[PDB]
Amino acid sequence: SLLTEVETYVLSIVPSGPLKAEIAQRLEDVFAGKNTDLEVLMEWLKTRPILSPLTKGILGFVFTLTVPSRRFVQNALNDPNNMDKAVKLYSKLKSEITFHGAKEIALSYSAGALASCMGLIYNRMGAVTTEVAFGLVCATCEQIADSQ
Numbered sequence: 847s848l849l850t851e852v853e854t855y856v857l858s859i860v861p862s863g864p865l866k867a868e869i870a871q872r873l874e875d876v877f878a879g880k881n882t883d884l885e886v887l888m889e890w891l892k893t894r895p896i897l898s899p900l901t902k903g904i905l906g907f908v909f910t911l912t913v914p915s916r917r918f919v920q921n922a923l924n925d926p927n928n929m930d931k932a933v934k935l936y937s938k939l940k941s942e943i944t945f946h947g948a949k950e951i952a953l954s955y956s957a958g959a960l961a962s963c964m965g966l967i968y969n970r971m972g973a974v975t976t977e978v979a980f981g982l983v984c985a986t987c988e989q990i991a992d993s994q
Contacts, residue, residue: 923965
């Protein structure tokens with residue numbers, strides 16, 4: 847029942863318009879379990895015109911964690927010392943297993959460290975569990991959508 851907490855949070859950073867409409871459907875399709883060919887929605891993201899590199903990074907991060915079994919996302923997630931806090935946070939998320947446990951800790955750090963922390967996990971999608979990674983996405987999305 848936590849999959850909806852990722853949905854609404856991701857739909858908070860995407861700029862309003864005819865793009866939040868397209869992304870909305872593509873999300874609630876893989877969140878129902880029909881799409882399998884991972885490298886289709888990946889390409890679909892990369893070519894979309896009103897998406898910031900950061901949004902393409904988070905969306906690409908979420909899609910990968912779903913689908914059963916890229917450089918344009920790594921270069922979006924990863925510029926001063928925010929990497930320094932990310933490395934230590936990354937070493938902590940290994941300890942945590944549940945979604946809410948990591949989200950509680952990740953929400954306590956800067957928005958810069960979180961987005962870069964996601965870059966660390968993308969290199970190893972097996973180092974940490976999925977529930978935690980969602981918690982990182984949820985904490986990341988909220989803090990960057992908390993500026994205004």
